Amino acid sequence: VTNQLQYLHKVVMKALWKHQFAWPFRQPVDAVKLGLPDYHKIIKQPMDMGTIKRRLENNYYWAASECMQDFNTMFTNCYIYNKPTDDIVLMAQTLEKIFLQKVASMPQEE
Amino acid sequence: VPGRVTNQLQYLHKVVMKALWKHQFAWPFRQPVDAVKLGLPDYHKIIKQPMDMGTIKRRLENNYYWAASECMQDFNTMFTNCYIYNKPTDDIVLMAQTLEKIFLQKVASMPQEEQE
Ligand SMILES: C/C(O)=C1\C=C(c2ccccn2)c2cccc[n+]21
Ligand SMILES: C/C(O)=C1\C=C(c2ccccn2)c2cccc[n+]21
Predict the structure, then answer these.
(1) Which positions does UniProt annotate for a protein binding (chain B)?
(2) Around A93, how many Cα atoms within 13 Å sit in the side-chain half-sphere?
(3) Which of A10, B19, B70, B114 could hold B65 in an S-S bridge, CB 3.0 to 4.6 Å?
């Protein structure tokens, strides 16, 4: 537990987890269920909010920039895998914009 | 009267942007994408909001941003355009990821309270 990590749990994750666009990112991408047979050929580090939330709850992270990187990876995976015109890209952009807004007011010192 | 000068914006300019700019992978990002000179006739059909570190640097220098998050959004847009336009296997994608990680590392150390 640091001040920065607690801000990411209570302020950042809280904001994002309950968002109306959050639902495709709450659990790991299931390639079989989603019909995406190349997903893991293209994405080598899958990431999702459920994993991140769990990690925060279980005190997995030693620094806030670590947790921050998990959020970025999740969003980046989405942009790299999907087609430019897909709704999901649009949903990821919206969520990423809230992420950065909250992260701007995050405590400076670990 | 677009924006002002804050502590966070001074930090994004002198500490975050400076590091990224001088990075060995930064060269494709220092100026707007010239789709003609590069032979990418579909760029502007796919990327609706072009952004580059040259534009962000100028905006910082002319007090265009009102708050830090506005400048952060511009950084995010630059990185996202790259991921969205380019093929997953392209070198450019790897370069952007590297820069994006540094950006996040340095944003984590930005002053918490925005003061004019
Ligand atoms: C994160 C991501 O790329 C997802 C996430 C979904 C998704 C779609 C429905 C239910 C849960 N997740 C999806 C569908 C098609 C293509 C890509 N994705
Ligand atoms: C930011 C971006 O997407 C760039 C930027 C370049 C680039 C290529 C050569 C010189 C300057 N910039 C490029 C080339 C091919 C595909 C994509 N890009």
Answers:
(1) 42, 85-87, 90-91
(2) 21
(3) B70
